[PDB]
Each structure stands twice: as structure tokens, then as C-alpha cells.
């Protein structure tokens, strides 16, 4: 694929000296950059990764497909209460391959409404004709008969074939019901655009289409005897089975014996009017060769000669070979081929196709394909996943679980985790490596995606990546909210020279019930020890305690020790003699600076308190 | 992010009346919810908390005895259950939510009369 | 219960004059202060909160200061979609209100 990086300001024009092009790869996958190590090129082009969907509507359709995935339970594994395992199975894998099918049609929607290219609706309806295809054949049956469930299955294929392309669009029922030279309708038109929407199902159109001209008209008067059959045979039309097997095989009894009687009978109308009655008779009979006849594409005969012929698969390789030799597979579009590959047996090899329309689909369809076992791990052996080691559905979801983290959306960031999480296959350990390494990246803003990353990390025991998060997060009221270890000693000695100088948070640690909870370290304590302090010191007892306290406190731990002398100094038994000489035993600019400020010599000053509070002792 | 909020309307004086508020888009599990109201053409008055952390609740004295406040953290949902009301209690009620209170609800009108 | 005192109750300002709103504490509550803008018939909607920190998105043209217990929004230049009545939060209780209108 060949994109333009700017189609505005292109960096080169001739072979002028071939310059030097970078490119490096950004965080963001829609946000890259590319710039020239060159002479008056000096500009920055912001290049984003070649057909990314970057859309709500992509994420919505993802979040979709990842509930399918994550709802199919147990059941997105395959087996290699007895009997009734293997039915019930497909059951719900059939179910989910409609859920997936579903979402992907609602997705298709919302881009043909919100769009600026319409590209995007085109791929992702074939996408979806060629699911719908594939579910009519493998997942209805189950391996069985038409009998076995002639409902669905004709439901689905009637489905499959009326979604594929528009004809007959009713732009074109018009477009004959207009143009003459003929006498009302009765041209190889009419008839050709009748036995089409046979062919296809579509009775109700058919039955339409006919009410239209001649029911009545020509034939009620000019020959009553094919006006019974014109006539009965739109009835039989009107009740064709959709749910017995049985009453089909009545149904198409009643049909031959109206081709029959007509077929040898009164011909009081035209020459070609006979036919063209005979025509739509031996069609809706289920002659091969007439089936064929009024086919304009493969899949219309196919469909045909499983709703009037014969309703067996076990004949369907045959059908679909007739089919071709009328009319060859229409290269035009990317879902005809698929289809066939599909209805023909060979379902794989469509994975990589697929990825190149859409990397998710893809990804989802290899995982329904192993669930259904159409798919299987055939390696048999290097410590991790992302590999061929495991299947080739583990192997694209995980793909995508990574083209997912650089996207940037933290809403399918969950859905990246999740798929890896969920992953089949793969040690617990293994797994918790790749999240261990993918983590970081999640673009967390509001509280909650931080909380969601930490209940990640504690989900899966990741305390050192937890740890770095909240390092990242710790770099006044931000260092309140974080109170590793030299960072909690520099906070201790901090809250010690506020103290020192000398709110709410310090009540807390000494809307308020809420946070008292959360707070239910050292440096915290001494805070809170200081504050208390200074409490009692606000409200002559209680002075010496908090003296008593102050002088312990700095026995604990230069500047805080020249506080304390100042107190002590403001303030101016055996108790306080004894703390006194050990401030004393224990006794740089910061604190010169600090002494300054206070006196706005120190040890001096010190000395001569001691003697003081010595003399006053000897006093007392 | 989004606060909902239901269930007011018209109601009989000494009637009763559940307010719900549906969040979305943050944890509600550490979150305060609040009930804020305003009369016509008059200012705020908060009336009542809920920690969902703790399950403390508190109310202003003008409601207290007749409005109940509860949360259902598992449905992310704030109630307001508000018994015997009166034409005083008429007015437009938001929730909003603290983690000041930066996410509101669009508001419900309850009006009470016979 | 604490009151809180906008004042004024009501000011006229033009367009590109700069607006200042005063909120007085009944008691000393702390910069556990909130500033709100209500709109008539919609959800009053968070301007400043811890008396001084500006939330997310809202236009730096509003700020928020504190001097002991008096405190002060200021709109540095005001603009005509600026009209609306603008509260003082610290029971949680909300100040008056203050009634901002475009003069011509």
C-alpha cells in the first residue's frame, strides 16, 4: 500500500541528491513522526500508522466482540451430560458466530451513516456476506441434513444470499415495469426478473410482480385454463414450507402435479406465453436445467436448487459445480470466491485475508473457528505466548491485543488486557509478564483508571509495577497526599522545620470520617507528635511534657536540636536536668542561617541556658 | 462521566418519594455522594452526604428525620428516600459527587402539593 | 451550621472589565473552598476548588485567592457568555450567590 506521508507538503521533488529521511514509531499509533537530517529542511511531519481506525464506532464494534468472546465462556474452547456436551456446543458456538455476525452488521451501519469514506461500509458488508455464508454451512447443522433443522437453515440462507449484493434493486423493478414494442408485460424481462426473485426466495416480490399485469387481465379473460394455474400456483407460492421437511415433500408434490395437468392441457394463449407459463412451473418444480437457465450469478443457482430441488447438502458439492459452469465466480468483488471456498470445504486460509481487511474481525473469526474446531493447535514442542507455538486464533488475538495497546483509547484497554487474560493458552506466569509490561502504558487520567490498574496489579500480584505506577503518580498538597524510604525521611524533616516555624491533614494524623478510614509511617507519627506538642504548648505541666517530648524527640534524630534550645531559651526537675545534659552530650549553614533568624554565639547561648536551668534546679 | 438522576415529579404534601441517581464513569465505591437542592429562584442547599467508603451519612437539620440517604455500590446508585414532604421541600434536587464536587447531575424537579 | 457571605449580591460589569466576587466564612473554615457558576435552568458547574487550584478545562480567565477568612474569585476579563449567578461553598454550606450581569 503506498500512502501519501503528506498531501500538502511534500519533503523531496527530484533525485537532487538523495536526502536522509527518519522515521521513528510513536506511543500512539496515530501519532508518529518523520523528519530530514538535510539543509533548509527543518519541518516535523506527524505521520499516523496507514489505515488505523481510530473511530467510536470501531471501539464500539470491539467492545461488542469482546463481550461475544468473553460470554462464550468455557465454550470459546473446543473438547477434542454425555452426548448432549457436543449438541449443546454448537448451540451456543452457532449463537455466538450470529452475535459476531450481528455486530459486525451494526458496525458496518454506523459507518455508512457517520462517514467521510464509505470504503470502510463496502469491505465490511462482504466481510459480513462471506460470515453469513459461512454460518448458513457450518454453523446450523452441525454436520447433519436440512431435516435436522429446515428452519433455521433456510432462514439463514435465504439471509446470506439477500445481503450479498442489492440486485434485484428496485431501481431496477421500474426500469422494465417502464420500457415499448410489446404487448403489456410478457418479454424474457418480466419473466427473467420473476423466476430471479424465485430463485432467491423472495415469493413475496415474486407474487407482487404478478399482481401487477396480467393476473387477472389476459389471462382471466383470454384462456380460463392457464388462469388456474397462473392462479393456484401464486398459492402454492404463498405457502411454501419453511419448517416441515415433510410438508416441503408434499409441497413439491403438488407442484409437479401442476406442471403436469398444465403440461398437457387447454393452450388458448400465446406461443411464447405458454412457454414463459411452463417456465416459471418446471423453476418453481425444481428442474435442474431451468434453474440453471434463469441464473445471472452462481449463488442464485445454488440457492436454488437447495429451495426446489433437492434440500440435502450431500449434494451441494454437485450443485455448486453446476452453478459455475453457468456462471463463473465474479472477481469484482472479495466475498463470491470466500463463499465458495466455504460451501466447497476449504475454510482455512482466510485468516491473513482477512487480517488485511480487518486486523479484529479476523481475530474474533480464527477464534470462533477454533471453538467450532474447524482450527487446531497442531505444534507440539520458549517460555511464552505470542507465538506459533500455540494456535493460529491465540496467535491473532493476542496480535491484536497489542495493536490495541498502542491505540491509545483507554476504553479498550480493558479489551487488550482482558483478551491476554483470557488467552487459552499460556502460563499464569507468562501472562503475567506481558501485563507486567503492558501496564505502564495504559493512558490513565481520572482516579478510577489508576484504581482499574492497580485492581490489575493486585489481580495479578504485581507490586514492583504498582510501585513504579505510584512513583510516577508521586512525581505541598501532592507530597501531603503521598505520606522510597530517603523520599519519607526528607518529607519527616521537612514536616519537622514546619513545626518548627510554627491543617486539616494535621488533624487527620493526630468529609473527616472518610479520611480518618483512609488513613488507617514513621515520619507520619513524628508529625503528628510535633503537632500535639504544639497543641499542648497553645493551651506549666503541660509545658514540661511537651518540652519532654520535644527533647525525645531530638534524641531520635542539627536544626531541629537549635529549635529546641530556642524553646528552651523562650521558656526560661530531675527529669529535665537529665534530657538538658543529654541535649548537651549530643550538641551546617542551614542551621547558622535558622539561629540567625531566631536571634532576628548560638552555642554560647546554649551553654549559658544549661547553667541557668542548673542553677534553677540547685534552687528548687 | 455521568450522574443520573430519576424518580422525582409531582407529589401529594406528607407523601413520600425515592429519588435514584445511576453514576457512571468513576468509583463510586470511594466516592461521597451528595444531595443538593434549589427552590425556585432561591440558592443551593446542600441537605445530605453519603460516604460509600464508610457508609457514613449526614443530613442538614431541615430534612433530617424525613430524608433517608442510602448507596448500592454493586449498581453504582445513590438513593434519596424522602418521606412526609412539604410545599418548604418543593424544588429542583441534583446529586453530585465528591472523590470539591465536580460531577453533577442534571437535576429532577420535585414539586409537592394538593 | 457555617454561613457564607458573598458579596456583592448582584454587579453589573462590560465586556473585558475584570470581576471580583468576595466570600466571608461565618467561622474560620480552611481553603476547603469551592467556586461554582449556575447558569439559569441548568446544574451549577465547578470552577475552583481548595480555594485556589483552577479545575480541569475551565478557562484561566477565572482564579481563585485567599486572605485569612475572606475569599476572592476573580474574572480577569469577562465575556458575555460570563453572565450567570457564581456560589461559595466551605454540613457542606454555599454562600447567597452573586448575580453576574452584561451592562450597556
Known amino acids: 500500500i503506498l500512502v501519501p506521508m503528506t498531501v500538502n507538503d511534500q519533503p523531496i521533488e527530484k533525485n537532487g541528491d538523495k536526502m536522509p529521511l527518519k522515521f521513528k514509531l510513536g506511543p500512539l499509533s496515530y501519532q508518529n513522526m518523520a523528519f530530514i537530517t538535510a539543509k533548509d529542511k527543518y519541518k516535523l511531519y506527524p505521520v499516523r500508522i496507514p489505515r488505523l481506525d481510530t473511530s467510536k464506532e470501531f471501539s464500539a464494534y470491539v467492545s461488542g466482540l469482546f463481550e461475544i468472546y468473553r460470554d462464550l465462556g468455557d465454550d470459546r474452547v473446543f473438547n477434542v451430560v454425555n452426548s448432549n456436551f457436543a449438541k449443546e456446543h454448537n448451540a451456543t458456538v452457532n449463537l455466538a458466530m450470529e452475535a459476531i455476525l450481528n455486530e459486525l452488521e451494526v458496525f458496518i451501519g454506523r459507518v455508512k451513516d457517520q462517514d467521510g469514506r464509505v470504503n470502510r461500509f463496502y469491505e465490511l458488508e462482504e466481510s459480513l456476506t462471506v460470515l453469513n455464508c459461512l454460518r448458513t454451512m457450518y454453523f446450523i447443522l452441525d454436520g447433519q441434513d436440512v431435516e435436522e433443522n429446515r428452519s433455521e437453515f433456510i432462514e439463514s440462507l435465504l439471509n446470506w444470499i439477500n445481503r450479498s449484493d442489492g440486485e434485484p434493486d428496485e431501481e431496477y423493478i421500474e426500469q422494465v415495469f417502464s420500457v415499448a414494442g410489446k404487448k403489456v408485460f410478457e418479454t424474457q424481462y418480466f419473466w427473467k426478473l420473476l423466476n430471479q426473485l424465485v430463485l432467491r426466495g423472495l415469493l413475496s416480490q415474486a407474487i407482487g410482480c404478478i399482481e401487477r399485469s396480467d393476473l387477472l387481465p389476459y389471462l382471466s379473460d383470454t384462456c380460463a385454463v392457464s388462469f388456474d394455474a397462473v392462479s393456484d400456483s401464486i398459492e402454492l407460492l404463498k405457502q411454501y414450507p419453511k419448517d416441515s421437511s415433510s410438508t416441503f415433500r408434499e409441497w413439491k408434490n403438488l407442484v409437479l402435479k401442476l406442471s403436469q395437468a398444465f403440461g398437457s392441457s387447454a393452450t388458448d394463449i400465446s406461443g411464447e406465453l405458454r412457454d414463459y407459463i411452463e417456465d416459471f412451473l418446471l423453476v418453481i418444480g425444481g428442474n435442474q436445467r431451468k434453474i440453471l437457465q434463469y441464473s445471472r450469478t452462481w449463488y442464485e443457482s445454488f440457492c436454488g436448487f437447495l429451495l426446489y430441488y433437492i434440500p440435502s447438502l450431500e449434494l451441494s458439492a454437485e450443485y455448486l459445480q453446476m452453478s459455475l459452469e453457468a456462471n463463473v465466480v465474479d472477481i469484482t468483488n472479495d466475498w463470491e470466491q470466500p463463499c465458495v471456498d466455504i460451501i466447497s470445504g476449504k475454510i482455512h486460509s482466510i485468516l491473513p485475508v482477512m487480517e488485511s481487511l480487518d486486523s479484529c474481525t479476523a481475530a474474533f473469526t480464527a477464534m470462533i473457528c477454533e471453538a467450532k474446531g474447524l482450527i487446531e493447535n497442531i505444534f507440539e514442542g520458549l517460555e511464552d505466548l505470542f507465538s506459533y507455538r500455540n494456535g493460529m486464533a491465540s496467535y491473532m488475538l493476542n496480535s491484536f491485543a497489542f495493536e490495541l495497546c498502542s491505540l491509545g483509547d483507554k476504553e479498550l484497554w480493558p479489551v487488550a488486557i482482558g483478551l491476554i487474560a483470557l488467552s487459552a493458552t499460556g502460563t499464569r506466569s507468562a501472562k503475567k509478564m506481558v501485563i507486567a509490561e503492558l501496564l505502564p502504558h495504559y493512558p490513565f487520567v481520572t482516579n478510577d483508571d489508576i484504581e482499574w490498574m492497580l485492581s490489575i496489579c493486585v489481580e495479578w500480584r504485581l507490586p514492583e509495577i504498582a510501585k513504579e505506577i505510584y512513583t510516577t503518580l508521586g512525581n505541598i498538597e501532592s507530597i501531603a497526599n503521598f505520606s522510597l524510604v530517603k523520599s519519607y525521611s526528607w518529607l519527616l524533616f521537612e514536616a519537622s522545620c514546619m513545626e518548627g516555624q510554627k491543617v486539616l491533614n494535621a488533624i487527620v494524623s493526630k468529609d473527616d470520617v472518610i479520611i480518618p478510614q483512609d488513613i488507617l509511617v514513621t515520619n507520619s507519627m513524628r508529625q503528628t507528635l510535633a503537632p500535639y506538642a504544639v497543641l499542648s504548648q497553645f493551651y506549666d505541666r503541660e509545658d514540661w511534657g511537651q518540652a519532654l517530648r520535644l527533647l525525645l524527640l531530638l534524641i531520635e534524630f542539627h536544626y531541629l536540636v537549635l529549635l529546641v534550645a530556642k524553646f528552651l531559651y523562650p521558656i526560661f526537675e530531675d527529669s529535665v536536668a537529665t534530657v538538658i545534659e543529654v541535649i548537651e552530650t549530643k550538641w551546617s549553614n542551614l542551621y547558622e542561617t535558622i539561629i540567625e533568624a531566631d536571634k532576628s554565639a548560638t552555642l554560647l547561648k546554649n551553654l549559658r541556658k544549661k547553667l541557668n536551668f542548673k542553677l534553677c534546679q540547685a534552687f528548687m | 462521566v455521568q450522574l443520573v438522576e430519576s424518580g422525582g415529579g409531582l407529589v401529594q404534601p406528607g407523601g413520600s418519594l425515592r429519588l435514584s441517581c445511576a453514576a457512571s464513569?468513576?468509583?463510586?465505591?470511594?466516592?461521597?455522594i451528595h444531595w443538593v437542592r434549589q427552590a425556585p429562584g432561591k440558592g443551593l442547599e446542600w441537605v445530605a452526604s453519603?460516604?460509600?467508603?464508610?457508609?457514613?451519612?449526614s443530613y442538614a437539620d431541615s430534612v433530617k428525620g424525613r430524608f433517608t440517604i442510602s448507596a448500592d455500590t454493586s449498581k453504582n446508585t445513590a438513593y434519596l428516600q424522602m418521606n412526609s414532604l412539604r410545599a418548604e421541600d418543593t424544588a429542583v434536587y441534583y446529586c453530585?459527587?465528591?472523590?470539591?464536587?465536580?460531577?453533577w447531575g442534571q437535576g429532577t424537579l420535585v414539586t409537592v402539593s394538593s | 451550621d457555617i454561613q457564607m457571605t458573598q458579596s456583592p449580591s448582584s454587579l453589573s460589569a462590560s465586556v473585558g472589565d475584570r470581576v471580583t466576587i468576595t466570600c466571608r466564612a461565618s467561622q474560620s473554615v480552611s481553603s476547603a473552598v469551592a467556586w461554582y457558576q449556575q447558569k439559569p435552568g441548568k446544574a451549577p458547574k465547578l470552577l475552583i476548588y481548595s480555594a485556589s487550584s483552577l479545575y480541569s478545562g475551565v478557562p484561566s480567565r477565572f482564579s481563585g485567592s485567599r486572605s485569612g477568612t475572606d475569599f476572592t474569585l476573580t474574572i480577569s476579563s469577562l465575556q458575555p457568555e460570563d453572565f450567570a449567578t457564581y456560589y461559595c461553598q466551605q454540613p457542606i454550606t454555599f454562600g447567597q450567590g452573586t448575580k453576574v450581569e452584561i451592562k450597556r
Open positions: 453530585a459527587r465528591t472523590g470539591a464536587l465536580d460531577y
Open positions: 453519603i460516604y460509600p467508603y464508610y457508609g457514613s451519612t
Open positions: 464513569g468513576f468509583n463510586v465505591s470511594y466516592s461521597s
